[model samples]
Target: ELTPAVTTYKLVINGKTLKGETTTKAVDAETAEKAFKQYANDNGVDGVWTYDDATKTFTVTEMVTEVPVA
Candidate 1:
């Protein structure tokens, strides 16, 4: 039986940081990747982010939005 693993993920968008957590029986790397990608896509984030499989780290480079700024 696989043991459940819990991990915290840090999400960045437009230099803003958001924190989230996910628990799974799988490894942290896989879990983190899944969560990060889902969050980014769902949030409509446009930019580059780095994911470190070894360290299970995620970093966001930039974010694009259609909203006009005043």
Candidate 2:
């Protein structure tokens, strides 16, 4: 059976100059990249803000993990 669904896009940036690892999850890749791109420019860190297509597998759904450990 096919189900209607919404996709969540992820944008991740990591660099030695970055204060820390950063990621943005949005409704689409354009949204994700634009938001993060703004963030990168706002912080004057555009140099390391290149979109890494190779790491597309490292998505928000896969990277985010939150579960209560008893």
Candidate 3:
């Protein structure tokens, strides 16, 4: 009942940034997808996110949510 928090998101591969933001030749598309989602859940990060197979990238966005405190 005090301060609000900020959220952020990023798509990574091999424990690193999405290779050039393009298709990555490192991990399987299916396996990679699961890994990515698991990472999000592990960190307890909630958001409205999406994934693209063509580019093998994910866009996890977190918009600020205001909780009424009056």
Top candidate by TM-score = 1
The residue-by-residue lDDT of candidate 3 on 1-70, one tens digit each, is: 2644322223743322223232223335566556556765575544666777665567655444569999
For model 2, residues 1-70, the per-residue Cα lDDT tens digits are: 2754434444544433555556555655566677766776676555433454556322221122359999
Question: Judged by TM-score relative to the true structure, which candidate is superior, 1 or 3?
Answer: 1
Model 2 TM-score, all chains together: 0.46
Clashing residue pairs in candidate 3, if any?
Answer: none
lDDT (0 to 1) per candidate: 0.58, 0.51, 0.50
RMSD of each: 5.0, 13.8, 15.8
Candidate ranking under TM-score, highest first, comes to 1, 3, 2
Per-candidate clashes, comma-separated = 0, 0, 0
Where does candidate 2 stray beyond 4 Å?
A: 1-16, 52-70
Q: Per-residue error at 51 for model 1, in Å?
A: 3.0
Cα deviation of 30 in candidate 2 (Å)? 0.5
TM-score of each: 0.49, 0.46, 0.47
Worst 10 residues of 3 by lDDT: 15-24
The residue pairs that clash in candidate 1, if any, are none
